[PDB]
Write an enzyme that holds these catalytic residues in place. Structure first.
Site, PDB file in Angstrom:
ATOM      1  N   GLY A   1       0.750  -1.274  -0.069  1.00 41.15           N
ATOM      2  CA  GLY A   1      -0.036   0.098  -0.036  1.00 41.15           C
ATOM      3  C   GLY A   1       0.644   1.322   0.021  1.00 41.15           C
ATOM      4  N   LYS A   2       0.095   2.371  -0.227  1.00 38.95           N
ATOM      5  CA  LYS A   2       0.770   3.824  -0.157  1.00 38.95           C
ATOM      6  C   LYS A   2       0.094   4.696   0.707  1.00 38.95           C
ATOM      7  CE  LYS A   2       2.234   6.823  -2.261  1.00 38.95           C
ATOM      8  NZ  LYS A   2       2.777   8.046  -1.883  1.00 38.95           N
ATOM      9  N   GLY A   3       0.723   5.574   1.588  1.00 40.19           N
ATOM     10  CA  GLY A   3       0.229   6.327   2.536  1.00 40.19           C
ATOM     11  C   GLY A   3       0.166   7.713   1.958  1.00 40.19           C
TER      12      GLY A   3
ATOM     13  N   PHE B   1       1.898   9.822   2.164  1.00 41.44           N
ATOM     14  CA  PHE B   1       3.348  10.132   1.676  1.00 41.44           C
ATOM     15  C   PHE B   1       4.096   8.794   2.039  1.00 41.44           C
ATOM     16  CE2 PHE B   1       3.731  14.404   0.164  1.00 41.44           C
ATOM     17  CZ  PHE B   1       2.784  15.021   0.972  1.00 41.44           C
ATOM     18  N   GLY B   2       5.009   8.202   1.089  1.00 39.21           N
ATOM     19  CA  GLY B   2       5.768   7.079   1.483  1.00 39.21           C
ATOM     20  C   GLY B   2       4.706   5.890   1.139  1.00 39.21           C
ATOM     21  N   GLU B   3       5.606   4.521   1.020  1.00 34.39           N
ATOM     22  CA  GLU B   3       4.911   3.329   0.721  1.00 34.39           C
ATOM     23  C   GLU B   3       5.158   2.519   1.919  1.00 34.39           C
ATOM     24  OE1 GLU B   3       5.764  -0.090  -2.684  1.00 34.39           O
ATOM     25  OE2 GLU B   3       7.050   1.789  -2.766  1.00 34.39           O
TER      26      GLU B   3
ATOM     27  N   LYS C   1       6.672   1.735   6.787  1.00 35.53           N
ATOM     28  CA  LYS C   1       6.257   2.654   5.892  1.00 35.53           C
ATOM     29  C   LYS C   1       7.563   3.474   5.644  1.00 35.53           C
ATOM     30  CE  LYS C   1       2.843   5.580   7.529  1.00 35.53           C
ATOM     31  NZ  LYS C   1       1.871   6.183   7.734  1.00 35.53           N
TER      32      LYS C   1
ATOM     33  N   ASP D   1      -8.034  12.999   9.824  1.00 36.48           N
ATOM     34  CA  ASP D   1      -8.164  12.071   8.700  1.00 36.48           C
ATOM     35  C   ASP D   1      -8.640  10.632   8.716  1.00 36.48           C
ATOM     36  OD1 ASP D   1      -7.911  11.824   5.709  1.00 36.48           O
ATOM     37  OD2 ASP D   1      -5.770  11.415   5.700  1.00 36.48           O
TER      38      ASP D   1
HETATM   39  C1  LIG Z   1       3.421   4.240  11.684  1.00 32.33           C
HETATM   40  C2  LIG Z   1       3.450   3.186  10.760  1.00 32.33           C
HETATM   41  C3  LIG Z   1       4.451   2.309  10.480  1.00 32.33           C
HETATM   42  C4  LIG Z   1       4.126   1.266   9.627  1.00 32.33           C
HETATM   43  C5  LIG Z   1       3.127   1.159   8.737  1.00 32.33           C
HETATM   44  C6  LIG Z   1       2.273   2.206   8.812  1.00 32.33           C
HETATM   45  C7  LIG Z   1       1.086   2.034   8.229  1.00 32.33           C
HETATM   46  N1  LIG Z   1       0.381   1.046   7.571  1.00 32.33           N
HETATM   47  C8  LIG Z   1      -0.840   1.060   7.055  1.00 32.33           C
HETATM   48  N2  LIG Z   1      -1.096  -0.266   6.590  1.00 32.33           N
HETATM   49  C9  LIG Z   1      -0.873  -1.451   7.283  1.00 32.33           C
HETATM   50  C10 LIG Z   1      -0.589  -1.802   8.689  1.00 32.33           C
HETATM   51  C11 LIG Z   1      -0.309  -3.066   9.105  1.00 32.33           C
HETATM   52  N3  LIG Z   1      -0.551  -4.201   8.497  1.00 32.33           N
HETATM   53  C12 LIG Z   1      -1.309  -4.059   7.471  1.00 32.33           C
HETATM   54  C13 LIG Z   1      -1.475  -2.726   6.615  1.00 32.33           C
HETATM   55  C14 LIG Z   1      -1.204   2.337   6.493  1.00 32.33           C
HETATM   56  C15 LIG Z   1      -2.696   2.069   5.910  1.00 32.33           C
HETATM   57  C16 LIG Z   1      -3.328   3.237   5.434  1.00 32.33           C
HETATM   58  C17 LIG Z   1      -2.456   4.623   6.127  1.00 32.33           C
HETATM   59  C18 LIG Z   1      -1.178   4.528   6.749  1.00 32.33           C
HETATM   60  C19 LIG Z   1      -0.781   3.231   7.228  1.00 32.33           C
HETATM   61  N4  LIG Z   1       0.513   3.307   7.755  1.00 32.33           N
HETATM   62  N5  LIG Z   1       2.376   3.139   9.788  1.00 32.33           N
END
Ligand SMILES: Cc1cccc(-c2nc(Nc3ccncc3)c3ccccc3n2)n1
Length: 293
Positions: free
Chosen positions: A12-14, A16-18, A32, A133
């Site tokens: 996935g994509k946030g 900002f960042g992947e 991320k 958000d």
């Molecule tokens: C602070 C942080 C560290 C690592 C990943 C994310 C993260 N992860 C997302 N996904 C998942 C997390 C865990 N398991 C599956 C999917 C996000 C999804 C949407 C927006 C931000 C995300 N940030 N955020």
């Protein structure tokens, strides 16, 4: 730490960042990754996750922030727990839920938001925090069927002593007052209320998937038939603020006590006036009681 984590799959994509599914000593974790020019976003999110007393079962479990130099450029990393189900958005698109399942998803989400919004007084006190958000795409579903809130990069923290915020979202979920710029951003409480409106929309997404007797609605994003797929502020404002429309409530929801309770909560989350909306704590109370019934 990032030094021993091996990325395995892009998941996935946030904003900002992947986001990646990595392995830390054999264990799956989420990573991320941001670029050097996205340091402020990376830093701000690391800052929010490191807030004292933030950990909660309904908030994505933060592991660490780190830097990783691959020899050419620097990657800015955030690492967290990994949840195979992914976002609530993906979950609701793939499955239908039972009455009990729906309540668990809604209750857990509300508990997480109530924790975020709640100020914990004490020597190791937690400041009240507003998400800004909230949406089905950044709420995650755990293996046990409960949700945890993620993507805290745009959050704001409140200082109760002076009633000020530590610093200065998705269009579809923007609250009415946000869409028409009438919201008072110097008032922290306004941010909390705006989060409630978004959670209301999320609840609507969940309820649609509550299958009773093989009957349920197809998955849809709020306002799916009123605005384009990637709506602008103006397109949303005309529908939400001017025409004053809200997600449609299926008549089917009047047949089940649980759905009736969910629908009432939604209505009480969508008031144009933030002050009239329910609080996360009140919603948690109501859902908790319904859960016992
Ligand atoms: C602070 C942080 C560290 C690592 C990943 C994310 C993260 N992860 C997302 N996904 C998942 C997390 C865990 N398991 C599956 C999917 C996000 C999804 C949407 C927006 C931000 C995300 N940030 N955020």
């Amino acid at each position: 730490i990032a030094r021993t984590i091996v990325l395995q799959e892009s998941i996935g994509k946030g904003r900002f960042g992947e986001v990646w599914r990595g392995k830390w000593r054999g264990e799956e974790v989420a990573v991320k990754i941001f670029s050097s020019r996205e340091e402020r976003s990376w830093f701000r999110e690391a800052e929010i996750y490191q807030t004292v007393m933030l950990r909660h079962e309904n908030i994505l479990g933060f592991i660490a922030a780190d830097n990783k130099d691959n020899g050419t450029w620097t990657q800015l990393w955030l690492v967290s727990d990994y949840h195979e189900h992914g976002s609530l958005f993906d979950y609701l698109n793939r499955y239908t839920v039972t009455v009990e399942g729906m309540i668990k998803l809604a209750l857990s989400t509300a508990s997480g938001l109530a924790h975020l919004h709640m100020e914990i007084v004490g020597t190791q006190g937690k400041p009240a925090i507003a998400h800004r958000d909230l949406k089905s795409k950044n709420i995650l579903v755990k293996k046990n069927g409960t949700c945890c809130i993620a993507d805290l990069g745009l959050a704001v923290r409140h200082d109760s002593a002076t009633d000020t915020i530590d610093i200065a979202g998705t269009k579809r979920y923007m609250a009415p007052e946000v869409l028409d710029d009438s919201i008072n951003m110097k008032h922290f409480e306004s941010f909390k209320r705006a989060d409630i409106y978004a959670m209301g929309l999320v609840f609507w997404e969940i309820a649609r998937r509550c299958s009773i007797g093989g009957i349920h609605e197809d998955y849809q994003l709020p306002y799916y038939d009123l605005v384009p797929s990637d709506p602008s502020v103006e397109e949303m404002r005309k529908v939400v603020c001017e025409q004053k429309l809200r997600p449609n409530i299926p008549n089917r929801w009047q047949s089940c006590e649980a759905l009736r309770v969910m629908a009432k909560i939604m209505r009480e989350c969508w008031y144009a006036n933030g002050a009239a909306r329910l609080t996360a704590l009140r919603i948690k109370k109501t859902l908790s009681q319904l859960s016992q019934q």
